[PDB]
Design an enzyme around this catalytic site. Structure first.
Site, short mmCIF file in Angstrom:
data_model
loop_
_atom_site.label_atom_id
_atom_site.label_comp_id
_atom_site.label_asym_id
_atom_site.label_seq_id
_atom_site.Cartn_x
_atom_site.Cartn_y
_atom_site.Cartn_z
N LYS A 1 31.58 -5.76 32.02
CA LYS A 1 30.72 -6.17 30.22
C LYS A 1 31.84 -5.81 28.80
CE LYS A 1 26.76 -6.26 29.68
NZ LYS A 1 25.13 -7.36 30.09
N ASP B 1 3.93 -19.57 21.26
CA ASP B 1 4.20 -18.23 21.74
C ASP B 1 3.74 -17.93 23.16
OD1 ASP B 1 3.67 -16.92 18.70
OD2 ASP B 1 5.33 -15.65 19.74
N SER C 1 1.55 -0.54 31.34
CA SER C 1 1.75 -1.57 29.68
C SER C 1 3.11 -2.07 30.04
CB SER C 1 1.89 -0.61 28.56
OG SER C 1 2.89 0.41 28.57
N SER C 2 4.04 -1.13 30.78
CA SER C 2 5.00 -2.60 31.00
C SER C 2 5.36 -3.49 31.65
CB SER C 2 6.50 -1.24 30.87
OG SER C 2 6.54 -0.01 29.83
N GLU D 1 14.80 2.40 35.48
CA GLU D 1 14.40 3.50 34.86
C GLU D 1 15.37 2.49 33.51
OE1 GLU D 1 11.39 3.18 33.16
OE2 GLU D 1 12.44 4.05 30.79
N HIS E 1 16.22 5.81 38.00
CA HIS E 1 17.75 5.02 38.20
C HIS E 1 16.57 4.25 37.59
CE1 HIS E 1 21.86 4.16 36.98
NE2 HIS E 1 21.83 3.57 37.71
N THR F 1 29.76 -2.89 34.69
CA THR F 1 29.33 -2.05 32.86
C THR F 1 30.66 -2.69 31.85
OG1 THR F 1 27.59 -1.35 33.62
CG2 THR F 1 28.94 -0.38 31.52
N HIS G 1 21.90 9.51 43.52
CA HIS G 1 23.19 10.19 43.38
C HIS G 1 22.62 10.94 42.02
CE1 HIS G 1 22.27 6.68 39.78
NE2 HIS G 1 22.32 7.27 39.19
N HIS G 2 21.14 11.15 41.85
CA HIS G 2 20.43 12.77 41.35
C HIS G 2 20.18 13.31 42.14
CE1 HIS G 2 19.81 9.62 38.02
NE2 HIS G 2 19.19 8.87 38.89
N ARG H 1 20.13 23.75 32.54
CA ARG H 1 19.99 23.06 31.96
C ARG H 1 18.03 23.73 31.18
NH1 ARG H 1 18.68 16.86 33.24
NH2 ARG H 1 18.83 17.09 35.75
N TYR I 1 18.27 1.42 34.11
CA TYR I 1 19.26 0.67 33.77
C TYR I 1 18.16 -0.65 33.08
CZ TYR I 1 23.24 2.21 35.95
OH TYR I 1 24.28 2.62 35.77
N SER J 1 25.72 -7.76 22.68
CA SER J 1 26.40 -9.62 22.67
C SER J 1 25.81 -10.57 21.64
CB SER J 1 25.40 -10.10 23.77
OG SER J 1 26.21 -11.15 24.32
N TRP K 1 11.01 15.88 31.65
CA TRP K 1 10.55 14.73 32.93
C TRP K 1 10.04 14.59 33.48
CZ3 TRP K 1 13.15 10.42 33.54
CH2 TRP K 1 13.92 10.39 34.16
N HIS L 1 9.34 15.59 24.03
CA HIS L 1 10.91 15.26 23.28
C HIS L 1 11.41 14.17 24.21
CE1 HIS L 1 14.88 14.79 22.61
NE2 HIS L 1 14.84 14.43 23.83
#
Ligand SMILES: CCCCCCCCCCCCCCCCCC(=O)OC[C@H](COP(=O)([O-])OCC(O)COP(=O)([O-])OC[C@@H](COC(=O)CCCCCCCCCCCCCCCCC)OC(=O)CCCCCCCCCCCCCCCCC)OC(=O)CCCCCCCCCCCCCCCCC
Ligand code: HEA
Ligand code: HEA
Ligand SMILES: CCCCCCCCCCCCCCCC(=O)OC[C@H](COP(=O)([O-])OCC[N+](C)(C)C)OC(=O)CCCCCCCCCCCCCCC
Ligand SMILES: CCCCCCCCCCCCCCCC(=O)OC[C@H](COP(=O)(O)OCCN)OC(=O)CCCCCCCCCCCCCCC
Ligand SMILES: CCCCCCCCCCCCCCCC(=O)OC[C@H](COP(=O)(O)OCCN)OC(=O)CCCCCCCCCCCCCCC
Ligand SMILES: CCCCCCCCCCCCCCCC(=O)OC[C@H](COP(=O)(O)OCCN)OC(=O)CCCCCCCCCCCCCCC
Ligand SMILES: CCCCCCCCCCCCCCCC(=O)OC[C@H](COP(=O)(O)OCCN)OC(=O)CCCCCCCCCCCCCCC
Ligand SMILES: CCCCCCCCCCCCCCCC(=O)OC[C@H](COP(=O)(O)OCCN)OC(=O)CCCCCCCCCCCCCCC
Ligand SMILES: CCCCCCCCCCCCCCCC(=O)OC[C@H](COP(=O)(O)OCCN)OC(=O)CCCCCCCCCCCCCCC
Ligand code: CUA
Ligand SMILES: [Cu+2]
Ligand SMILES: [Mg+2]
Lengths: 45, 534, 104, 67, 55, 59, 51, 269, 236
Positions: free
Chosen positions: B319, B92, B157-158, B243, B241, B316, B290-291, B438, B245, B256, B127, B62
């Site tokens: 924004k 293009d 790919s990314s 990822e 992190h 943020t 921070h994780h 968890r 963002y 926006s 994950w 998942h």
């Protein structure tokens, strides 16, 4: 403004009914855990 | 037709295929979310009898399927591939075979991820696939190797899409696009494509180190032998992190644009907003641990990271304040992407406030690997990226697909997903602060109520997606009849007050980007000639 | 000009912008750009807007001035003390309002 | 236009009812037996044991949650 | 005879952010005083009675 | 050996696609098609043997 | 060759001129998409226990 | 000129690529490679014959892709100056992604080195492992990269100048220079006191130096292709972007080798 | 101590660290609820008074005064939020002069506790493996999935610092009542402190993934008075 009903009254009339419905929509967007706790058997229903 | 869909080096007919794998994998991932939350509905071994390894396999499926095969395709790949050449006036994209191989190496990562969950019971790690939980002693089999080969392929790919995007908006702009005149979604795809090639090399290095200390007998994280598993936590969250963002910055761009065009007002200070977004990008690398407030860092470096994540929190905030400023004073036409844009602000501000509750390294000792964390990220990832995805689809697909949807079904779909997803992730905070960890199959039966409430909500959140599937069908077979027979909304920008109808039919679309001037479904060679701008 | 606009520069700039229009698109465009600012314009602007709508010879934009203004103002005492200042222009130009035209 | 706010709130409440009914008849086929410490008779002993050792003294400590 | 009427969105937003400050302030003030002082007073009552019962 | 303008005059003046336009491009693509079809269809018959769990016969 | 453009020549599905109804393909796509974790659960529940 | 023979052209400098079947084939081969090397690492298939043919079909599909790109770049003639700056910036960003993989490997070395574990004897290098001294063979294959850079830069500046006998001599001797580097690097590997499994020191040392090893054998293949298409008159005097690409690559490979060499052979012993 | 059905607050206090964490979370939530209330109030006021607004003030696109005040206000609130968390983070690592030490080494799907401060005058260290009671041998009042047949037992009113590690997969020693949560990685020992201020039971769970038996891995810590703990340690 200068001539007319005063800005304090004519914006209080616009916003004072809005505060109560804001409190209603926030008390039912965050307060439904109270409503689901109220009917369960943990409150000796 | 084989050369138009299998070879197909044209950035319009690659984005449709990106979106097709996106809706396929999102259906598979939400089937897994339904199975997880259906098994966690009551204490005692439910529908899957015993078998906690199957639940670990389902939750890693998942998580990793819905992150790397729904949100990242349907935000970066699909929307960037269709819109980044179509907003800056390139005919293009540059390197067209590169963003064809990016799409075509996505679903083979998908099929090896699918066949990783069948062989030798299976990869269950979550994950964030950790050692020595995934080393060969405590987890034997070829399962997690295919599960991380999927991450190698999606990573490739990314990155290829990132290099594609960066060069195609650094060189092939139109005649008058200066270095700061682009629409804000182009800037979001720009900065996201920088964070990809600045971040995921470290990820692929760490996970291939995991692979060659699984199978090639090396000792990167095998601890009896020299290594340490803390190095994987560092090397993973240095991507982990950036990822998210990456996953949330095009959401900011989409939101926006839709609040700019559904309130008849330009965004309040676009230059300060893009400076805030770029500083969020270049600052999101400095807070990667921070994780890892629990694992045994010093109090001094923990003090540094809990100082720096609040300076992550401030732009943020400015924004969201600029979003409130640009919807203030407008003429808000409450259609169905504007509803998603309005809901995204509240449902992401809520998750960001509980995120800065998490960000204190003092306070993270009471909340780590606990359902409070699930309530935070299933706000800011789920509601954030996917309410922006829905406000991307319901706003752009009448122009892309050329078939207008049904409107009242779109609004019942929005209200169903809004109610039925606000009822899931809100009891997760009470489960978190009451003490639920968890990744448990299920739990000590004290907190037996909030899991049941979340499970009665997940069925609403699944039924709304079934209604979204019917919205796709009703759009695909009743597009022209929803144009004609008064079931849809036709003009997204309403005529202004003192403007006549005979004068609105002169200037039909009052856009600010190119995309709503191209005809429904646009020509395969749209910009034969360049699109001038002053 | 991102520097602010005082009220006299506002009314002079817009009077010289209502004088120059010749088509219907121009009159409705400069009327929208005059009404979608923050202040409500003084009647020196709006009687010139009525003349500029008379020059193009179409009626309903010489009525939607009055309804957009009723949406603009803060109460109805400002609206009545406004409308008795544009009385005779409304008389000899012969435009109606909304509330007497569509009684509901 | 023309009472479609009524149609969309009818659709929302109908979707809530449909998802509630389908969750009920999916819940019906799960597993016949419960874990044995779920009825109230076990819960009274399990919080008598708690008040023997005064756990959660000022907050809530009573566990029943079953009919 | 008419005065120039100007500045309604500025007055509206500086009337609105002040009421937003005070509205969030009274909600959070209820939270802190009511809920947190309820929990703190319960805990200090229990600890005072325990340190008295162990004499 | 300065054979670039003859190749350009050949490559511009044809209708066939680019990976088939060379004269000697028959020796590069037929055995490639054969070995590629073999090399990519062949693990999809070993994947149900892995799903059933039966390993190889080695040693 | 520029491929010819229309309202239904932008997607891989053929919708208008078919032999079977479009609902078959459009709902079978998400049927197999929604049923791949169920077949994963079945192949994992016959390998360990029962079902 | 005439409008009639101006509208018979591209109307914008950018590339319009005809539909080519080499994303789909190399993606098929990448899938087959990933599944077969996940399947043979556990003894499901008997030999390494199938991972061999999967790696081979990936290699020959990608070299057919590069055949298609050299034919399109110098025969059909589309790489104008805008497309040239585009592919130059794309290669710069790709190499910026490669050096971050190298930075992740250096992070692994630093994290397990400057805070040594209590099972290594609390000293870097660990006990018993005879570390490689930096002054015998590392000095030769750190001066050979500087000499390779010097000869590839005079071959470049002779290619821009106009002489052929110098611009070919520099490329031939830099190819044989770095393949002499690769062979003496393999000579260094085949007599070393520690393997890739011997502790964490051998693991991260062989990881870093082996990734640089594979990077320069890929550079040697790139430079062999560039020497072939320099001999066959493809490279011009002002349109050599596929050679500026590889000299940028070999100079950044030289500097990342000196970083790797200093902190892997001097500070880490 | 123990969780309660339909609860929406912390498992209550035992340690000064958990009291500080509770006070800090309530201070942070008090500073956050102003922001949440004004954000929700701004959104409500805007979308219910500018939907019935026929014209749009499209000539308002920047203002420096209000821009810098809404970018200097979150910096102020975040400084006030970060001002006491530094105090808590730098005091919750202060483990000067503890009384006794525990090792809490966690194996695959159980814990193994051991005391080795040498006042047990049988001579030895004392260890016990602390398996979960399997959920059919429960006997008429025993909390499901977080009970234990062999509890750890600690004294009241002494600072105890326990180290933690593993012999396998990374576990976590996690009690939310004592406010203690530290990842037991197999390579390093990690120490945390405690001062339990009242007698009674405290429950916790493993809060890192261990594999199949992640749920069947609880922590049960009974805190008794010091003479009863001395008697238990000498007898066991
Ligand atoms: C078992 C009861 C099933 C029906 C439910 C009760 C009902 O009639 O409600 C309809 C009722 C209005 O029915 P109506 O206005 O008489 O029908 C509209 C016209 O007759 C126009 O309707 P029509 O004649 O075009 O409809 C044809 C009919 C065709 O129905 C059939 O062929 C018979 C089979 C129907 C059951 C399957 O389809 C339905 O009516 C489906 C009804 C569900 O809708 C509501 O009460 C509000 C919606 C629900 C609110 C949330 C409730 C929770
Ligand atoms: C992409 C991110 C994402 C999203 C959206 C979700 C959404 C959901 N998730 Fe979660 N989840 C994670 C990522 C996500 N999740 C991660 C990373 C973990 C941690 C795993 C670990 O650490 O072990 C996790 C863990 C996790 C838990 C905690 C379990 C545990 O660890 O103990 C649960 C329990 O309920 C859960 C189930 C669900 C359900 C029912 C939804 C529902 O919201 C699903 C419904 C969603 C939709 C209906 C969205 C619409 C879908 C579409 C396909 C729209 C198509 C539109 C376009 C393409 C434009 N997942
Ligand atoms: C989409 C990616 C994404 C985004 C954008 C965020 C947003 C944030 N997150 Fe989250 N987070 C995750 C992804 C993300 N997170 C994931 C995947 C996990 C689980 C990982 C795991 O498996 O362990 C997680 C869990 C997580 C952790 C790990 C805790 C743990 O596991 O022990 C932390 C730690 O600091 C954190 C904090 C934050 C903060 C401060 C923000 C901020 O960026 C939020 C910014 C928004 C606001 C701040 C609100 C708007 C601002 C205002 C209204 C102005 C006023 C506000 C202030 C003055 C503060 N969240
Ligand atoms: C037409 C269909 C009408 C409904 C058909 C009957 C549905 C039903 O009987 O559902 C039963 C559940 C009871 O749920 P439970 O108490 O957890 O029992 C689980 C069942 N076991 C596994 C023990 C066998 O009952 C429920 O879960 C109902 C959902 C909860 C209450 C509904 C709340 C929604 C607002 C009203
Ligand atoms: C927002 C709109 C959607 C909210 C749906 C919440 C339903 C959760 C649930 O399913 O409620 C579960 C509770 C607790 O029941 P129990 O644990 O005693 O039952 C044990 C197994 N049956 O049952 C009720 O209270 C029934 C009354 C529901 C009132 C909902 C009010 C919502 C406001
Ligand atoms: C691994 C990732 C490798 C990325 C290489 C980036 C090169 C940048 C560039 O200059 O790419 C130039 C070309 C693609 O360009 P094109 O034919 O689309 O250009 C059209 C003309 N403008 O070579 C490539 O990228 C091919 C890279 C993949 C080769 C197989 C790799 C298998 C793994
Ligand atoms: C909470 C509610 C939960 C229960 C909902 C049941 C269905 C209700 C149907 C409503 C309907 O049908 O709304 C339709 C009406 C449309 O009216 P109109 O102004 O266009 O009328 C014009 C007549 N000519 O409301 C609206 O779109 C306006 C309200 C928008 C709501 C957006 C909500 C976004 C998420 C929340 C964001 C934060 C707000 C809350 C916190 C302050
Ligand atoms: C995409 C991800 C890119 C990041 C790559 C990270 C580093 C991986 C490659 C390290 C090379 C190590 C080496 O070359 O090791 C050399 C050793 C041999 O040494 P020995 O023990 O015989 O020495 C004996 C001393 N007397 O080979 C091995 O035993 C292991 C080989 C494993 C297979 C090669 C690497 C597989 C991954 C390559 C990915 C390429 C892309
Ligand atoms: C694995 C094997 C790697 C083999 C690499 C072969 C490189 C030769 C490519 C070539 O020869 O490309 C020639 C072209 C253009 O040539 P030009 O325009 O300069 O010629 C004009 C004469 N008038 O250069 C490029 O577009 C850049 C190609 C970069 C490819 C990088 C691939 C890296 C893959 C890593 C995995
Ligand atoms: C903000 C949301 C505030 C409303 C929450 C409604 C809860 C209703 C309920 O479900 O409250 C039920 C509980 C009952 O529990 P009990 O201890 O009586 O159990 C004994 C069982 N025998 O009431 C309470 O404990 C306290 C009263 C409500 C306190 C509100 C929540 C306070 C902490 C905030 C947690 C949310 C953090 C969010 C982080 C961003
Ligand atoms: Cu030990 Cu989970
Ligand atoms: Cu993060
Ligand atoms: Mg963790």
């Amino acid at each position: 403004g200068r001539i007319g009903e005063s800005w304090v009254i004519t914006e209080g009339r616009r916003l004072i009914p809005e505060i109560f419905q804001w409190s209603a929509v926030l008390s039912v967007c965050l307060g439904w855990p109270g409503a689901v706790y109220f009917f369960s058997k943990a409150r000796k229903a | 037709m084989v050369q138009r869909w299998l070879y197909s080096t044209n950035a319009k007919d690659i984005a449709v295929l990106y979106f097709m794998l996106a809706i396929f994998s999102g259906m598979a991932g939400t089937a897994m979310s339904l199975i997880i939350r259906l098994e966690l509905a009551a204490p005692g071994s439910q529908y899957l009898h015993g078998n906690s390894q199957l639940f670990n396999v389902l939750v890693v499926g998942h998580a990793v399927l819905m992150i790397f095969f729904l949100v990242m395709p349907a935000l970066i790949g699909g929307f960037g591939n269709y819109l980044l050449p179509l907003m800056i006036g390139a005919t293009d994209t540059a390197f067209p075979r590169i963003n064809n191989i990016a799409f075509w190496v996505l679903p083979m990562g998908l099929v090896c991820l699918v066949t990783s969950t069948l062989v030798e019971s299976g990869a269950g790690t979550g994950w964030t696939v950790y050692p020595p939980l995934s080393s060969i002693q405590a987890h034997s089999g070829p399962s997690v190797d295919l599960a991380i080969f999927a991450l190698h392929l999606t990573s490739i790919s990314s990155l290829l899409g990132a290099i594609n995007f960066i060069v195609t908006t650094l060189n092939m702009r139109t005649n008058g696009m200066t270095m700061h005149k682009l629409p804000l979604f182009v800037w979001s795809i720009f900065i996201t494509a920088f964070l990809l090639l600045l971040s995921l090399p470290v990820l692929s290095a760490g996970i291939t180190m995991l692979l060659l200390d699984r199978n090639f007998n090396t000792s990167f994280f095998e601890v009896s032998g020299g290594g340490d598993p803390i190095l994987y936590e560092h090397l993973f969250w240095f991507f982990g992190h950036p990822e998210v963002y990456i996953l949330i910055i095009p959401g900011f761009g989409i939101i926006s644009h839709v609040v700019s065009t559904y309130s008849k007002k330009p965004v309040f200070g676009e230059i300060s907003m893009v400076y805030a977004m770029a500083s969020i990008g270049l600052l999101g690398f400095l807070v990667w641990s921070h994780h890892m407030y629990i694992v045994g860092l010093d109090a001094d470096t923990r003090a540094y990271f809990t100082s720096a994540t609040m300076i992550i929190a401030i732009p943020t905030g400015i924004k969201i304040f600029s979003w409130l400023a640009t919807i203030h004073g407008g003429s808000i036409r409450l259609a169905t992407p504007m509803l998603y844009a309005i809901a995204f602000l509240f449902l992401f501000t809520m998750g960001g406030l509980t995120g800065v509750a998490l960000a204190n390294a003092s306070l993270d000792v009471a909340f780590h690997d606990t359902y409070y964390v699930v309530g935070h990220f299933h706000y800011v990832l789920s509601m954030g990226a996917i309410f922006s995805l829905f406000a991307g689809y319901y706003y752009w697909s009448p122009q892309i697909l050329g078939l207008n949807y049904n409107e009242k079904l779109a609004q019942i779909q929005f209200w169903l997903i809004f109610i039925g997803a606000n009822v899931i992730f809100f009891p997760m905070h009470f489960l978190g602060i009451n003490g639920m960890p968890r990744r448990i199959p299920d739990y000590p039966d004290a907190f037996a109520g909030w899991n049941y409430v979340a499970s009665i909500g997940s069925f609403i959140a699944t039924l709304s997606l079934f209604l979204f599937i019917y919205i796709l069908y009703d759009q695909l077979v009743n597009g022209l009849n929803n144009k004609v027979n008064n079931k849809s909304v036709i003009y997204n920008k309403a005529p202004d007050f003192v403007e006549s109808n005979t004068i609105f039919n002169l200037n039909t679309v009052k856009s600010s980007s190119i995309e709503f001037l191209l005809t429904s479904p646009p020509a395969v060679h749209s910009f034969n000639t360049p699109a001038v701008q002053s | 000009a991102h520097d602010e606009e005082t009220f006299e520069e506002f009314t002079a700039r817009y009077e010289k912008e209502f004088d120059e229009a010749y088509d219907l698109f121009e009159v409705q465009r400069v009327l929208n750009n005059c009404f979608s600012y923050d202040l409500v314009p003084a009647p020196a602007v709006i009687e010139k807007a009525l003349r500029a709508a008379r020059r193009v010879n179409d009626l309903p934009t010489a009525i939607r001035v009055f309804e957009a203004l009723k949406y603009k103002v803060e109460n109805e005492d400002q609206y009545k003390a406004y409308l008795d200042e544009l009385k005779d222009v409304r008389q000899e130009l012969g435009v109606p309002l909304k509330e007497e035209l569509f009684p509901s | 236009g023309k009472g479609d706010v009524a149609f969309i709130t009818k659709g929302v409440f109908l979707g809530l009812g449909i998802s509630f009914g389908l969750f009920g008849l999916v819940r019906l086929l799960a597993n016949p037996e419960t874990p044995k410490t779920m009825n109230r008779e076990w819960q009274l002993k399990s919080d008598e044991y708690l008040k023997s050792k005064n756990a959660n003294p000022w907050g809530g400590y009573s566990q029943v949650q079953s009919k | 005879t008419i005065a120039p009427i100007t500045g309604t969105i500025k007055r509206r937003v500086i009337m609105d952010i002040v009421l937003g400050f005070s509205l969030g302030g009274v909600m959070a003030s209820y939270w802190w005083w009511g809920f947190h002082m309820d929990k703190i007073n319960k805990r200090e009552k229990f600890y005072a009675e325990l340190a008295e019962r162990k004499k | 050996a300065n054979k670039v303008i003859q190749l350009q005059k050949i490559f511009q003046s044809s209708t066939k696609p680019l990976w088939w336009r060379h004269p000697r491009s028959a020796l590069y693509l037929y055995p490639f098609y054969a070995i590629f079809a073999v090399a990519v269809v062949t693990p999809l018959l070993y994947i149900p043997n892995a799903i059933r769990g039966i390993k190889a016969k080695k040693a | 060759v520029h491929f010819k453009d229309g309202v239904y020549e932008n997607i891989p599905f053929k919708v208008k001129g078919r032999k079977t109804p479009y609902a078959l393909s459009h709902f079978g796509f998400f049927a197999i998409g929604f049923a791949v974790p169920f077949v994963a659960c079945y192949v994992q529940l016959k390998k360990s226990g029962a079902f | 000129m005439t409008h009639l023979e101006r509208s018979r052209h591209q109307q914008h400098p950018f590339h319009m690529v005809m539909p080519s079947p080499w994303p789909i084939v190399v993606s098929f081969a990448l899938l087959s490679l990933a599944l077969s090397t996940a399947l043979t690492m556990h003894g499901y298939i008997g030999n390494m014959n199938m991972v061999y043919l999967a790696l081979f079909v990936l290699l020959t599909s990608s070299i057919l892709w590069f055949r298609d790109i050299v034919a399109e770049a110098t025969y059909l003639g589309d790489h104008t100056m805008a497309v040239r700056k585009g592919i130059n910036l794309g290669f710069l960003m790709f190499v910026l992604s490669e050096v971050l993989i190298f930075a992740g490997l250096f992070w692994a070395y630093f994290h397990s080195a400057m805070s040594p574990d209590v099972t290594l004897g609390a000293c870097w290098p660990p006990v018993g492992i005879e570390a490689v001294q930096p002054t015998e063979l590392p000095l030769l294959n750190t001066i050979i990269l500087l000499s390779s850079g010097a000869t590839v830069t005079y071959s470049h500046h002779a290619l821009i100048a106009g002489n052929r006998n110098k611009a070919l001599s520099g490329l031939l001797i830099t190819f044989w220079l770095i393949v002499i580097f690769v062979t003496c690097q393999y000579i260094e590997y085949t007599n070393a006191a520690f393997t890739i499994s011997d502790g964490v020191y051998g693991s991260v040392f062989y990881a870093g130096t082996g990734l640089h090893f594979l990077h320069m054998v890929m550079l040697a293949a790139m430079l062999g292709v560039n020497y072939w298409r320099m001999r066959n008159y493809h490279l011009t005097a002002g349109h050599h972007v596929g050679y500026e690409t590889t000299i940028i690559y070999t100079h950044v490979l030289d500097v990342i080798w000196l970083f790797l060499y200093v902190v892997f052979y001097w500070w880490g012993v | 101590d123990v969780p309660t059905p339909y609860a929406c607050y912390f498992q209550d206090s035992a340690t000064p660290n958990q009291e500080g964490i509770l006070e800090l979370h309530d201070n942070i939530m008090f500073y956050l609820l102003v922001i949440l209330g004004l954000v929700s109030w701004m959104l409500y006021t805007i979308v219910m008074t500018y939907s019935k607004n026929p014209i749009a003030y499209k000539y308002i696109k920047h203002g420096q005064t209000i821009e810098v005040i809404w970018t200097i206000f979150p910096a102020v609130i975040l400084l006030i939020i970060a001002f006491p968390s530094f105090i808590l983070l730098y005091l919750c690592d202060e483990v000067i002069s503890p009384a006794m030490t525990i090792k809490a080494i966690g194996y695959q799907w159980y814990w193994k506790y051991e005391y080795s401060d040498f006042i047990n005058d049988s001579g030895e260290t004392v260890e016990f493996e602390s398996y979960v009671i399997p959920d059919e041998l429960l006997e008429e009042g025993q909390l499901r999935l977080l009970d234990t047949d062999t509890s750890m037992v600690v004294p009241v009113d002494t600072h105890i610092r326990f180290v933690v590690t593993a012999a396998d997969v990374i576990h976590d020693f996690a009690i939310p009542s004592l406010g203690i949560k530290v990842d037991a990685t197999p390579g390093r020992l990690n120490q945390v402190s405690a001062l339990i201020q009242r007698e009674g039971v405290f429950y916790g769970a493993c809060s890192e993934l261990c594999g199949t038996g992640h749920a069947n891995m609880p922590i049960k810590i009974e805190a008794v008075s010091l003479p009863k703990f001395l008697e238990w340690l000498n007898e066991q």
